[PDB]
């Protein structure tokens, strides 16, 4: 198995235990370096949109690694080109956080760690008919990264937790793995409106847990959405799976990978996007 906190099965081991593909040279997360990135004005505003006809329930599970929101099929989509033609279909959203407020994110922005990084996972429905077809195949996946930052003074309604509908209260010490509960749907469009959806890093990388598949189109928004200390401590109430050394769920993030390890056979480039000025 694998873990975050057991040194025998933890992230420094994955390159050996899961060489396909945790030994690769296109791994994630990376440090997102504003100065050492290429501005590409062709990269458009991201849109998240829902199929109005979908009625199926959303669930959340403590999978032992994270809190994972499981979206029904054919419901939530991403557009990178302004057309609402279902090229990318959202599967799930999960989170990475810290034992303490000064770490938790997988990506860094110029070396800075956020307390909470959310990952919206989608498959390239344009090419592949289902998640199970896309998840192991080339170019199959696109993930959105959303940074969260803690503020002392804020109304609930302008926090990310309004979009999350507080996960219907499931974030607590009794939400043990592998428990799943029905929750209110997540308003992913409202979530995206809490930041600038034109301002993002873009690169080709990997899943950040084994098997670290190098088939992820990454988009990481530079502006964070806002949460309170009370909200970040809700995540810290979840218990880790029995694979972990630590009892409480926290520090569920992979260490930083290089954009171009010395052994790369073809360098990748970190791109940045900004709004049409
Ligand atoms: N796509 C994905 C899946 C999972 C796992 Cl393995 C689940 Cl069991 Cl949902 C997780 S996990 N184990 O919830 O952190 C992370 C990702 S990520 N960071 O987007 O690479
Ligand atoms: C929208 O949801 C309906 C009802 O569940 C479904 O039959 C339809 O295929 C969905 N549309 C897309 C584009 O997935
Ligand atoms: C979510 O969290 C706080 C309760 O401590 C509250 O102010 C808010 O009304 C809750 N929202 C919903 C939808 O229950
Ligand atoms: Zn993730």
Author numbering: 24 to 300
Task: Share the article's original sentences.
Carbonic anhydrases (EC 4.2.1.1) are widespread metallo­enzymes that can be clustered into eight families according to their amino-acid characteristics and differences in their active centers. They are present in all living organisms, catalyzing the hydration of carbon dioxide to bicarbonate and a proton. Clorsulon is an anthelmintic drug that is clinically used against Fasciola hepatica. For this purpose, the inhibitory activity and isoform selectivity of clorsulon was studied using human CA I and S. mansoni CA, revealing different modes of binding of clorsulon that explain its inhibitory potency against the two enzymes.
On the other hand, SmCA from S. mansoni was strongly affected by clorsulon (K i = 224.7 nM) and AAZ (K i = 42.5 nM), despite the latter being more potent. The benzenesulfonamide scaffold showed the same binding mode with the hydrogen bond between the O atom of the sulfonamide group and Thr231 stabilizing the binding of the inhibitor, as in the case of the complex with hCA I. In addition, this moiety formed a water bridge to Thr232. The second sulfonamide moiety played an important role in the location of the inhibitor; indeed, three hydrogen bonds were observed to Thr232, Tyr27 and Asn86, blocking the scaffold in a hydrophilic pocket inside the active site. Indeed, His200 in hCA I reduces the space available for the clorsulon tail and forces the second sulfonamide moiety (which is bulkier than the amino group) to move towards Gln92 (Gln115 in SmCA). On the other hand, in SmCA this residue is replaced by Thr232 with a less bulky side chain, which makes the active site more accessible, driving the sulfonamide moiety towards a more hydrophilic pocket, with a rotation of 130° with respect to the hCA I complex, and also allowing the formation of interactions with Tyr27 and Asn86 (Tyr7 and Val62 in hCA I). Taken together, these observations could explain the different inhibition potencies of clorsulon against hCA I and SmCA and the 20-fold selectivity for SmCA over hCA I.
